[PDB]
Design a binder for this molecule. Structure first.
Ligand SMILES: [Cl-]
Ligand SMILES: [Cl-]
Ligand SMILES: [Cl-]
Lengths: 8, 226, 229, 9
């Protein structure tokens, strides 16, 4: 998907 | 003398790409009752995002095979339902950790936003596989968690904060793909991209590894949606 | 009450597509336990399933051993403990495969290609156990791996052409066993060279599809010879 | 590092 990485 | 060992083994499990083990170590560390550091929150999210990511990917493969069926047999549905049930169990475990420990015991706004974004995310993963009246309830729970995180992030974090950005990115994806609100998804992503973009290049050595990857995803989604 | 053999085989094919190799291995173990022989297609589903499961454990083990060695050459017992846990799980999967091979699949007669396939598997999973073994236990495990590979070699030489992909793969793995496990690099190079040349001499006789399959494994022999010489 | 045969042959 075009969703956020797990780490941020 | 166990929490330090659990976090050290979760770091080793990540390096060895043993994400089921990593998730078990981080669940154990959370269950110690102590708050998680910024580093430790990412070990928890990396562990479960990789576990559930593999289940989501497998589920999409099996559902896509069902879109062929008779251009077969009940086995694809049975096996997709097994994968679906395991995925739901992992999401329920994460949401249980969030409610029984992490959201209540979060000490600052950035951590609280991080966990509420996680809550919205795992309800969204449940919504990806849910159908009917249950899906409506799950969608409401996901929107509630994301909206609470949005309210806190707007009052407590700068528009360039990577966690605030990732939240808005995911909530816009929730609007487009889950809630059938493409207009709200475009409005949110464009607002997010612009407000962060105006400040990203004006900061002094702040968190850029986080921001750059998220803003690529916003730019790419906006390209597909418009 | 139980699941049909055909359904287990169909779900093992789905599990491969979905890259759920632990599930695939469980479906194939169930299909083997039905007592019926495996087709060429089914033999590959069994090997693909367990090779991927054990491959992930081997890779994790190498990462953890590399960290452990560096930590000696960061003063905690957790690296050794976690490497030992992964090691024990890897050994359990190898023992499961070897148990399937001995209790059902390997027979004293039957299709030579399938027997060679299973004896090569036996040599391979004893070799994976040797990768993590130490002391007098390692010596026993190495002998078991050489016995299985040698029996497969003897059958393949008398029953299959030099270009047979399974014969080629066996020779490739037995040469790696010689080089990496048994400390016999000379025998490893000799075997790889011999296997490649005997197959090359016979390639002219093959159909387009057979030549693609054989030359795919001959490229692995070519690659290791370049690395070793 | 070297290679060994694929699982499917
Ligand atoms: Cl981190
Ligand atoms: Cl049956
Ligand atoms: Cl095949």
């Amino acid at each position: 998907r075009g969703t956020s990485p797990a780490r941020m | 003398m166990e929490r330090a060992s659990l976090i050290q083994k979760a770091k080793l499990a990540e390096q060895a790409e043993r994400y089921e083990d990593m998730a078990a170590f981080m669940k154990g560390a959370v269950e110690k009752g102590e708050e998680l550091s910024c580093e430790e929150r990412n070990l928890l999210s990396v562990a479960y995002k990789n576990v559930v990511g593999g289940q989501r990917a497998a589920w999409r493969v099996l559902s896509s095979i069902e879109q062929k069926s008779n251009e077969k047999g009940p086995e694809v549905r049975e096996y997709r339902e097994k994968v679906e049930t395991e995925l739901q169990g992992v999401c329920d475990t994460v949401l249980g950790l969030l409610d029984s420990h992490l959201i209540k015991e979060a000490g600052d706004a950035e951590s609280r936003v991080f966990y509420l974004k996680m809550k919205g995310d795992y309800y969204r993963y449940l919504a990806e596989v849910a159908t009917g009246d249950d899906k409506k309830r799950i969608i409401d729970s996901a929107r509630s968690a994301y909206q609470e995180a949005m309210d806190i992030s707007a009052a407590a974090m700068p528009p360039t904060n990577p966690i605030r950005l990732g939240l808005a990115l995911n909530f816009s994806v929730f609007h487009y793909e889950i809630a059938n609100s493409p207009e709200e998804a475009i409005s949110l992503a464009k607002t997010t991209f612009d407000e962060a973009m105006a400040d990203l290049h004006t900061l002094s050595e702040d968190s850029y590894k986080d921001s750059t990857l998220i803003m690529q995803l916003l730019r790419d989604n906006l390209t597909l949606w418009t």
